[PDB]
């Protein structure tokens, strides 16, 4: 549990999320493979939208150092997480938190409070 990589973890309550500098490898739908990916969340309570939209927070997916666009179902099964220091404790910590918190995409890279 105790490690030197946890000193940068941040908890944000307005959206119930964890911000951390970490890169992910993801198997999508058990058929697609991607490496060095991450998320960015944007909290927006006042956005001009229609009845189809109901979520304050909008998420975006980046892969490699490039934006990624996915249309198919985003079935998510983590397989490896790496932090700058390269400690492997993150690989089990990520699972522990993800099980702990109920909201989707429990850990992201950056959060933008539009208001």
């Amino acid at each position: 549990k105790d490690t030197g990589a946890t000193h940068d973890l941040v908890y944000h309550s307005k959206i119930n999320t964890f911000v951390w500098d970490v890169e992910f490898d993801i198997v999508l739908s058990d058929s697609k493979e991607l490496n060095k990916c991450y998320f960015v969340k944007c909290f927006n309570p006042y956005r001009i939208n229609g009845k189809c939209d109901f979520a304050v927070s909008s998420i975006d997916i980046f892969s490699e150092g490039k934006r990624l666009l996915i249309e198919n179902e985003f079935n998510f099964k983590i397989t490896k997480a790496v932090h700058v220091a390269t400690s492997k404790d993150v690989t089990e910590i990520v699972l522990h938190l993800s099980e702990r918190i109920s909201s989707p995409f429990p850990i992201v890279k950056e959060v933008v409070y539009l208001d």
Binding site: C52, E73, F76, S103
Partner: protein, 670 residues
């Protein structure tokens, strides 16, 4: 120390043992006959004294005071950014060393630092022989400061500019960077004053502080008087005579500002001055807000209900734009109710915002670019355009500002999302007219043309794209058709898949035939396609076949869930498709009732389909942290689910003491 001068504009006796010469001078000023009594040369000297004291603002004794007024007027092109006039004054032929000093200050202001260095060197060369000590001293000071700024800029550029600019820049050559480094070898500023004639050391002692490493250290410490809490309960106004600390601090700030900008000193661009202004302004505004709140508490709400203890004007606007970054402005915006403070002299602030826009257009429309000037200028423009939300603008000025912001602001500092935020902030105070609508339509058309290239792709730091621009367009005008976009669509073809996707986000702006043609290209065949279209594609209505497909999915998932009960194992889940369907049903979007049979899988789905019969002990309060305003209002609307959520929110705010839960329970529900 014979007398004590005050920002009030009055003088007082202090530890003087002798004749009261100042009182006699004021008596002479009051009466013309006494001025007649004096001799002739004495009369001329008295006139000079009168001119000086009136110009700098010393009025009369403290006992003989009155309802003295106060106003600040800084006479300097540099404090108003009259860039063109500065350039013209630079281009003319000088007549005296004073004009050369002014020209050097303007040259350094405009970013061209090497010319400033050369001019200051020439001034130093000539002034010593010309026997003008003041300009010699001040020019030595300014040349040293310019050298320091040049060196710091060189280091910062060679460190990070090649990365942030995308290419290594060389604003200065190497011959110059070797020459100045050789000349300023072992030069120390600390003995500059002591090496001057003792006549200068006697007459001009007050300027010694300009050779010290840091000044404004007593002024910063004196700011602690604005953080006192005893005053609101009981205040004496001991600061001077009946002047709260607010007035004294503000007038001291104005004195420092005026002295530095008027005398053409180059210490105005360094970190210490910016930090001092930041601290002073923030503390003043915070104290004003606290006084307002305490007065509201003591007396009734009707007393000072929306009173603004602090009042902004042109000077405060320019100072806040220049010296604050975006983070500082946001801190002040999230610390006090800035919406409750009114702004004055809006024509001048309107005339200030348009000048910034024209300067941006001049800087970036032309191929030439002064990088160093562009890095000391973009910050003020950004901050001013951000702070311009609180002031009412005219139509033509608003059009100029919007055009400059949308077409010419460099992308390296204002990406698409920040562009959208800055643009949207302006409409809060001013209702959108047709002209700005046309400008934004032109921007959208230009982006559509940009999207022809296959490699082109919008990059945003907050997930805001052209769809948001279109939504903003449509919000203030329900009926609108883009003719250029319409004809663009009419010539559209299948192989332009990127254009297809791009203008799929702008369906409401297209015409009937155009949208028919576009929808002729794409269709939905599965649930995944359905939600891809709903997200991107704007499927407004659930067709009956879509509903039947949804029911088919639901029955398939029912079978899978039965087989899962048999398994007793669930690896992981990513996205709850059932929850979206349940919420849509609650939002009166799916009119079918078959899925009501498909109940008992997801607690959220049950909550969103049959709230009356759902078991609420399974309710998770965190669910409330993802819904938006409309959904929360709807949840408040229903009766079967109001008081239970009241109870859970109350319990959570009691135990957690969280602010978001209190916000929802107060603004919505009870």
């Amino acid at each position: 120390y014979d007398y004590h001068f005050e920002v009030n504009g009055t003088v007082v006796r202090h530890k003087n043992k002798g004749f009261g010469y100042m009182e006699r001078f004021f008596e002479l000023k009051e009466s013309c006959d006494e001025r007649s009594k004096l001799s002739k040369k004495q009369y001329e000297r008295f006139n000079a004294l009168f001119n000086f004291f009136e110009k700098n603002g010393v009025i009369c004794m403290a006992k003989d005071a009155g309802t003295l007024n106060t106003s600040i007027e800084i006479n300097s092109l540099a404090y108003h950014g009259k860039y063109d006039v500065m350039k013209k004054f630079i281009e003319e032929q000088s007549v005296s060393i004073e004009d050369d000093y002014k020209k050097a200050f303007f040259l350094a202001c405009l970013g061209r630092w090497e010319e400033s260095y050369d001019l200051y060197s020439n001034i130093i060369l000539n002034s010593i022989d010309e026997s003008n000590g003041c300009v010699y001293y001040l020019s030595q000071i300014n040349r040293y400061r310019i050298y320091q700024s040049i060196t710091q800029a060189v280091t910062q550029f060679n460190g990070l500019g090649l990365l942030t600019f995308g290419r290594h820049y060389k604003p200065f050559t190497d011959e110059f960077l070797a020459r100045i480094e050789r000349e300023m070898t072992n030069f120390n500023i600390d003995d500059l004053f002591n090496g001057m004639p003792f006549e200068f050391q006697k007459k001009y002692k007050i300027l010694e502080f300009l050779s010290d490493n840091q000044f404004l250290y007593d002024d910063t410490v004196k700011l602690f008087e604005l953080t006192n809490k005893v005053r609101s309960e009981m205040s004496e106004g001991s600061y001077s005579f009946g002047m709260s600390s607010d007035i004294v601090v503000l007038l001291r700030l104005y004195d420092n500002l005026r002295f530095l900008y008027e005398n053409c000193l180059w210490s105005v661009s360094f970190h210490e001055f910016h930090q001092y202004i930041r601290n002073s302004m923030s503390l003043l505004i915070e104290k004003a807000e606290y006084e307002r709140t305490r007065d509201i508490d003591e007396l009734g709400f009707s007393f000072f209900g929306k009173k603004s203890g602090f009042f902004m004007e042109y000077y405060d606007f320019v100072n806040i734009s220049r010296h604050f970054k975006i983070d500082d402005i946001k801190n002040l915006e999230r610390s006090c109710s800035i919406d409750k403070i009114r702004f004055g002299e809006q024509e001048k602030i309107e005339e200030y915002l348009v000048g910034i826009a024209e300067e941006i257009t001049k800087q970036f429309s032309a191929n030439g670019m002064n990088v160093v000037f562009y890095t000391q200028f973009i910050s003020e423009a950004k901050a001013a355009l951000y702070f311009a939300k609180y002031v009412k603008l005219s139509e033509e000025g608003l059009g100029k500002i919007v055009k400059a912001l949308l077409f010419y602001f460099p992308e390296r500092d204002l990406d698409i999302g920040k562009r959208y935020v800055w643009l949207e902030r302006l409409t809060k105070c001013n209702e959108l007219p047709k002209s700005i609508i046309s400008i934004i339509d032109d921007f959208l058309v230009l982006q559509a043309e940009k999207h022809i290239d296959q490699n082109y792709s919008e990059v945003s730091s907050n997930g805001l794209y052209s769809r948001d621009y279109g939504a903003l367009i449509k919000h203030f005008e329900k009926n609108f058709i883009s003719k250029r976009l319409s004809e663009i669509t009419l010539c559209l073809t299948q192989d332009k898949q990127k254009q297809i996707d791009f203008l799929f986000k702008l369906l409401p702006l297209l015409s009937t035939n155009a949208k028919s043609h576009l929808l002729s290209f794409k269709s939905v065949e599965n649930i995944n396609d359905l939600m891809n279209g709903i997200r991107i594609g704007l499927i407004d209505e659930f067709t009956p076949e879509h509903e039947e497909l949804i029911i088919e999915y639901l029955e398939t998932r029912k079978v899978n869930y039965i087989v899962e009960k048999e398994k007793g194992i669930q690896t992981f889940s990513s996205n709850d498709y059932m929850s979206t369907f349940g919420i849509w049903y609650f939002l009166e979007e799916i009119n079918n009732s078959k899925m009501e049979e498909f109940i008992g899988m997801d607690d959220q789905y049950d909550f969103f389909v049959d709230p009356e019969n759902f078991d609420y002990k399974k309710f998770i309060p965190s669910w409330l942290k993802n819904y938006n305003d409309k959904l929360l209002g709807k949840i408040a609307g229903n009766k079967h689910m109001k008081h239970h959520v009241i109870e859970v929110l109350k319990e959570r705010v009691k135990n957690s003491n969280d602010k978001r839960y209190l916000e929802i329970l107060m603004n919505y529900f009870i």
